[PDB]
């Protein structure tokens, strides 16, 4: 159950990273515009 809990947490982390990557791409578009 402890290992499963860590797996669950790692999933949230990967999900967060994906969101971060999206934000970086969006911010780069803003920089490209200016």
């Amino acid at each position: 159950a402890e290992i499963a809990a860590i797996e669950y947490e790692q999933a949230a982390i990967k999900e967060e990273i994906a969101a971060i990557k999206d934000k970086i791409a969006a911010i780069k578009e803003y920089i490209a515009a200016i």
């Binding site: 290992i3 860590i6 797996e7 790692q10 990967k14 990273i17 971060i20 990557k21 970086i24 920089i31």
Partner: protein, 34 residues
């Protein structure tokens, strides 16, 4: 095996994070320049 799978994923995640760290720094550099 599950512990090993988590450990493998952490290597990849840490690799992504280091790349993100550089992207964030680049964004700040560019924002300051323009």
């Amino acid at each position: 095996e599950k512990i090993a799978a988590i450990k493998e994923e952490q290597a990849a995640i840490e690799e992504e994070i280091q790349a993100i760290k550089e992207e964030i720094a680049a964004i700040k550099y560019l924002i300051a320049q323009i």
